[PDB]
Amino acid sequence: QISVRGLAGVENVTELKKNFNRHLHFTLVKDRNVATPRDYYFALAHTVRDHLVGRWIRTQQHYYEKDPKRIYYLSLEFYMGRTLQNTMVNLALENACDEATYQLGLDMEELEEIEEDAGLGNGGLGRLAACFLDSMATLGLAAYGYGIRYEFGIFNQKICGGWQMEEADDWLRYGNPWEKARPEFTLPVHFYGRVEHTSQGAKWVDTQVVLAMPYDTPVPGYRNNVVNTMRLWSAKAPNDFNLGYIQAVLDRNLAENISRVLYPNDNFFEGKELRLKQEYFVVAATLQDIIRRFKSSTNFDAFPDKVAIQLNDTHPSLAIPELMRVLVDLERLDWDKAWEVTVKTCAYTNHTVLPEALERWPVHLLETLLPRHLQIIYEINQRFLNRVAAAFPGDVDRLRRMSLVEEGAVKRINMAHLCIAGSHAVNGVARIHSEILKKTIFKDFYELEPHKFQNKTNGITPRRWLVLCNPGLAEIIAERIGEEYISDLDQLRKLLSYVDDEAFIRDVAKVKQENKLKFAAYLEREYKVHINPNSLFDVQVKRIHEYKRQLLNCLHVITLYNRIKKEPNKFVVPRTVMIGGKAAPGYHMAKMIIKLITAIGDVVNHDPVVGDRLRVIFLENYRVSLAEKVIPAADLSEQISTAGTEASGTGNMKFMLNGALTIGTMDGANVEMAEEAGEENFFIFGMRVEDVDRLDQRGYNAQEYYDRIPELRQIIEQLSSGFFSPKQPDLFKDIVNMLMHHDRFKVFADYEEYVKCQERVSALYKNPREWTRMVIRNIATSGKFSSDRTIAQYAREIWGVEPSRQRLPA
Amino acid sequence: QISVRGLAGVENVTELKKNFNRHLHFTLVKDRNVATPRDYYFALAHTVRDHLVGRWIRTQQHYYEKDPKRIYYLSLEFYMGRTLQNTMVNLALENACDEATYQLGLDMEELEEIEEDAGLGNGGLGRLAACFLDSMATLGLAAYGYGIRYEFGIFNQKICGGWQMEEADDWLRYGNPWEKARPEFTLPVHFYGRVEHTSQGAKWVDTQVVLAMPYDTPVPGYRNNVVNTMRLWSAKAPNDFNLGYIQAVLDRNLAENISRVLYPNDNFFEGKELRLKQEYFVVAATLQDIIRRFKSSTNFDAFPDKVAIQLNDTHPSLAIPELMRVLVDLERLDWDKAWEVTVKTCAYTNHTVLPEALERWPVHLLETLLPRHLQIIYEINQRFLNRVAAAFPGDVDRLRRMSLVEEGAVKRINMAHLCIAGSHAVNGVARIHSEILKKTIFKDFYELEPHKFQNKTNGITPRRWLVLCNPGLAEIIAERIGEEYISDLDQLRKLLSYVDDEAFIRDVAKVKQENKLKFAAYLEREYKVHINPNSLFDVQVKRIHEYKRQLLNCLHVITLYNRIKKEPNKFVVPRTVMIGGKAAPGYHMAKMIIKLITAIGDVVNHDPVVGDRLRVIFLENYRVSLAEKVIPAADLSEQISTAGTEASGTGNMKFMLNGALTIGTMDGANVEMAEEAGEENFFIFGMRVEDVDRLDQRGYNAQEYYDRIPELRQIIEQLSSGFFSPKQPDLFKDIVNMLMHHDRFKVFADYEEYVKCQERVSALYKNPREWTRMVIRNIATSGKFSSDRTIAQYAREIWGVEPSRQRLPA
């Protein structure tokens, strides 16, 4: 059909059809009379998987023969979404598979929709791992993603009476055709026991064994025939586990609970034993697997020339004391040589500055569960504080602040401090975030070892986030500047010479209108609700947090509503406000915000005076595959975090790539995005970081804004009096009370400038041609935000490996 | 190589090799450099499975079009063992697959040995289900086996210090290539709740839902292209199950524990809630599946013309009140019409008379878990006792004895009484067993409805139990009388005209010597122990029970030992005594017997005066695939149950088919076997049933035998004094004390006649030619004990369907 989706050769289409029927018969054991669309999806999935395996075996073989340095990306999260369409894109099979299914009388797009998301993540951090894996395969790096195969990923969100309900994401019920169990590479992981000191050093004994069984999933590179491996561990009891008889067999569940469920508490820390078990489990199994590969090439001096270990936040920080444990206790290296090897191998990526996200594990927990790692941690702390004392003699305060061990009622280990100590490189995820790390929470560590601290501004894969989710945009761009940009996104800059081309302006605007018609239709079919596709699509999709200020969006929405009701016969630019995202199940305030959003919808969407001029939709079950649909259909991207709180953001980048303009604060990658597009092509508003600090020093009094802004007083009176909750008049008193007395994130401080900036958005939207020219200037400067740029920078400045764009042979 | 293993055509061998390499590459994602024997087994298993699926789809389609009456075999047990070699036999692929693997440089026999047993059974009852499934496919019946897919089957037995240790049978760790998950045929099962009475009758409400997900396994018929289905249910929680958040997801295990583990308590009843949940789960899911198939042909008058339900003991007795519940509560039939349908549909097979095996469920359990079935059971009891009262007016004792409800501290439901009431046919499993049912435990039920009670003497499939486990014997028989006997075992009678043929006598004896060399070698390789293959192979393999009298065997062994030590320089026929079987984990006495057997071994096997003249081996982990090895290698089959205790036996039949002679009591099928061979070709000894009753009436005083048999006094003094346990001198006082004071099974009563009969066995073994002629007379009369004869009798006399031997088209 369209050029970027590849050739549909007579021979390819004939083979895909033949192999589809072979899998339907042999693999699914069905004939065409009894087959459901689900059987058809599986037959296609097995057919496309067969094109991966030759390249998978060949790539793994090539790494064995060239023996290149290997990158291990350790994360508790891989937010992969669906695999079928991504696999077709990167193998150039999309047009052939579409033709082949068409000739068998099936619609491929209906089959793609049957695949469950691999929801093995919460949000930004897990999705960055997924984009990175795609980018690492596309740039020919010998990279392994290592995680946990959770039986249940992020919960499915249902709204019930406007309230979030959680149900279990049973993504494996029907099977995962993409994974290959490797029960033969099963490894023991130890917990509890105690430490004996011998003549022969320390020995970890009387431990509980849990088995780690790996599952390999292919990670195809973009059209280069490279297929890397994501290896996810699953917990299995040993066969003598407990071994009256019945209860012993049933009690095997206890050990396998380790790989059972993803913790859904995004950007918040709970010190539960089960989470620490998940952290040690992925680290123990992964490091044995790494060390076994390294020995199949005595001497660990070359370990760091052969191994890079990247730590996705502190979640796998135990990699540091575990590498020390293996190298000292099992391999009998002296401490200093083992430490040299550990530091040169490990690198740490920080993903937040919110203090309630930092991992501080109680000592009593580590003492019970990992008694030897607690010993190794104390030893690291002691030698580290001897370096600080020597660097800054007499500074006893710096010693206390920099300690890996915090004093208090409960002593805790600061896992961030452990990572900085044990890593040759610490990076933030946007330039402003990396600067704050050096100015504030890691100032003391920066002053000791300035050489460690780097920036690696985040990115997104233009494979999933443009070719896959927005083919119409990919094609009109490819008509003008070719296909090379898909693996070299800087080439999009060539589109600036088309900013005054009436044909390109028309095509950009037509793709956007098509994506909006298609998404408007998807809201009717699957969720029975009617939206004007001529309206401006105002979308805020991300996890529900106070720092992301969905409430500031709510305040603007109630303002537009109040202005219409005051002057009903005045023209306004019609809008559909879409807000979506999951709340952490115990995060009460996040749950109230979801309920406020649906409550605003119930008032606004059924006011006849309002008409089709304003709609508020809460988008249910926001996940990767819903992002692929709503982001191509957006006109306005809402990136309105309090300055200094969004480490980077990545949704922001997705929307810039897909032809939305951005209303946002000078926070995270928003700064670099405005810098790349020019500030005149960006709806910047509100406090800068420096303004937030000025407010903190004198004190944030929200009552001042209530007193001075009559429009804002009215909204708080509506919330209080039960305008939006007539049955429970006091349903939102927690929100009012938080906004007036306990707002960490200064929603009122940014209200005036936000509403003013939102007026300028509506103004530009009235002039379609200038709106589309501003969009062209955004798409055309979004090149820097490709995860290929990001990974090439990890590769060169942290890992010491040279990316490659060379095809492997087929 | 040998004729019965089929053709190895140039084309077949070429295709098997090509498809083996396709599965190794595409399915297992390995190349020949990294493949383990386990990968090679899986590639072969997938290659053979591909030959099944055409026939599976075709057979299922044929049943849809012909719409024949359907047989549902309901069992909690299917002791299937390995599938690979059985599949090759019934598809005639064994020689081709052996050639195809040979040409790829692999030994098929080493690959067969990597397959785990499907150990979804304890013993005789579960194995009879497996033989039946093979026989039902071979005789062209439209039959479905329905059970539970247990995650852990019968425990793996390890001996440790001569004691049984149990470990978990994790048979699924590496995957099951034979099964096809059918998540789309998932069905709800209800538990707990309570009963509302409306105008519209009774309603079962506020129930807990557990999902039943079916797994289909093919059951190939012998060379007829018929492939029937064994459907096993697995328990899954619903996705709103429990739905703080984490514990709710972890608490899903509670619901899935239903399909987690096989109860290993053979021939003993424990009234645990979890067992009753397993019983209701298989019945609820199975009956919805049956009723859905029946409606895809309003009127339930034709239900019994379309459905037969066979109950493998009382384990699925709830099928009766469940069919009533569906037909009355959901389909709104009146009670009497629903009961007519239920009785005409259901048939009950009794498998024991030991009172401690009968299921008597406490009423408080059924009241909590299945409140509506308890109501339906009371209603059945009331109407049933009105028939008894009318038949036998005034007989108030008969009313009490025949009640489905037993009085006591705990009221109980007698599930046997429920089955007789609710079934048109009740059968025993051997002629003497069926007679005892009518004379004793069901005398009252026989007198009310004599028409219900039948016999169906048990059988074994000559596919697994001769062609598969003993190819050399199958071939020499086929040289003389052709291949037709494999699906018509009565034809073995033609071998009587070869009883005086020097060539056939030599061939029978040579196969036996070959099987003994091969088995003797298997004891060295896998369990490091040395046995004389010229010795008589005396084997007793079956679950360890007191009624099976392994202790009587022990007493003979200690006697042979004591005779050698008294006259060391006297000739004796050398023997290897092999005893094997599992003890139920809580059955203390069974565990002590295993320990006594190993204790006898430690004394006897290391006495230098004894030499290679006597060996006692305990065969570890007795299971189906070990039976396939040891039964072909046996000379003497030990079937020495107290008369009236072994309902039938089936090991007895296996050994008769494979060229062992039988030392046994007049118990179970032993009677029919001696009747078929002639008593002169059988080592019959001990009390008949009538003798046991004479002893019971006057009282069994074991002290009398101790007083009168000096040889027996000596053994009891050796046991007591610690001759066999020098470290713990009183280790066996429980066994001595049971034998002297509490022996339900009269081990001493049969001792004299057993030792005398064992002398006649040794005498005949000294004359090889006459031993082999007696063996020929056994093999040649073992035809009746084919499960094809058994199933043809269920088919004609219970199910009302005509067996067929016609090929389906390929």
Ligand SMILES: O=C(N[C@@H]1O[C@H](CO)[C@@H](O)[C@H](O)[C@H]1O)c1cccc(-c2ccc(F)cc2)c1
């Ligand atoms: O998700 C995170 N942080 C986010 O990381 C992305 C990617 O760099 C940034 O774009 C974005 O600005 C930033 O908010 C993030 C950071 C620390 C911890 C956790 C976390 C904690 C407990 C859990 F159970 C699960 C997850 C998540």
Ligand SMILES: O=C(N[C@@H]1O[C@H](CO)[C@@H](O)[C@H](O)[C@H]1O)c1cccc(-c2ccc(F)cc2)c1
């Ligand atoms: O196995 C049985 N009975 C045996 O059945 C076979 C087949 O008909 C006969 O040959 C043999 O003589 C007879 O002993 C049998 C009979 C009742 C209940 C159970 C049982 C109970 C609880 C469990 F948890 C598991 C199983 C097993």
Ligand SMILES: *Cc1c(COP(=O)(O)O)cnc(C)c1O
């Ligand atoms: C990209 C993405 C995110 C991260 O979005 P932010 O706006 O950076 O928080 C979260 N969830 C999903 C499903 C995503 O695709």
Ligand SMILES: *Cc1c(COP(=O)(O)O)cnc(C)c1O
């Ligand atoms: C046949 C068989 C049995 C039944 O043997 P009995 O001697 O009738 O108790 C038990 N276990 C296995 C493994 C069998 O093959």
